[PDB]
What we know:
- 2 copies of one chain form a homodimer.
- Chain A has 93 residues and is an alpha+beta fold.
- Chain A has a single domain, classed as Winged helix-like DNA-binding domain superfamily/Winged helix DNA-binding domain (Arc Repressor Mutant, subunit A), CATH 1.10.10.
- Chain A has helices at 5-16, 21-28, 35-42, 46-58, 78-92; strands at residues 33-34, 62-67, 70-75.
- In chain A, strands 1-3-2 form a 3-stranded antiparallel sheet.
- In chain A, helix 1 runs antiparallel to helix 4 (46-58) and helix 3 (35-42) packs across helix 4.
- The PDB classes it as transcription regulator.
Amino acid sequence: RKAALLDQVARVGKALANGRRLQILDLLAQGERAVEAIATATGMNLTTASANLQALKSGGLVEARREGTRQYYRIAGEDVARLFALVQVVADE
Amino acid sequence: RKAALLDQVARVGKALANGRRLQILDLLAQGERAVEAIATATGMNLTTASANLQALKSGGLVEARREGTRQYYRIAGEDVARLFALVQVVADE
Lengths: 93, 93
């Protein structure tokens, strides 16, 4: 069988399924940034930013680390960077 | 600006955001099939299948043609076939 690979692809799709959330990906691509910085750069309040970052994380698209009172997020790997580039190609059509 | 490329990537993500809908993509990859056949192969009723095919179409992932009383769907291009392969790689993690 193919599953439960497809349920996780579904989680990838869910993570991608918000246009404003995709701004975060462009911002992190490339260079890890703190939540505060990501919120400020995208004009999102801290709650919205953190919710969207969680959504990206559940889809396996970003990783996080805690340093002091801050949290730093980055694009999870090259495959994710290739994926985000290619989905923009597909979208461009 | 990047948009409204990102709103369409969001539509791509939305199309991908259903695990059972992704079975359709595996089925069509590769070889175009009629709605009836896709419904039967995936165990979906005709309404569910057609709804899921519409969802795939809005995300630019499949194309359709009408032949008589039937409708045939296929994967929209190579970039979509590469995309679906790569998202499974990303998901596999």
